[PDB]
């Protein structure tokens, strides 16, 4: 059997959250981006994914 509870978000969390660049920079031979990767309180993120 699986765990009854205490491992599942019950409100509206988001699997596969998406982020898009808040800053961009392009050179003749490079591309530069930076995202405001906000994990958000009450959470934990693994960068393997």
């Amino acid at each position: 059997v699986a765990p009854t509870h205490d491992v599942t978000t019950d409100r509206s969390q988001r699997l596969t959250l998406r982020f898009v660049p808040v800053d961009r920079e392009d050179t003749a031979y490079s591309y530069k981006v930076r995202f405001t990767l906000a994990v958000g309180d009450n959470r934990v993120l693994d960068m393997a994914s």
């Binding site: 059997v1 699986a2 765990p3 009854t4 509870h5 205490d6 491992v7």
Partner: peptide, 19 residues
């Protein structure tokens, strides 16, 4: 300190599940 948290949320086989 009127409780213990422990931690058993691990699937469950019976009264069990760790390591």
């Amino acid at each position: 300190a009127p409780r213990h948290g422990s931690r058993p949320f691990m699937g469950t086989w019976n009264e069990i599940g760790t390591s």
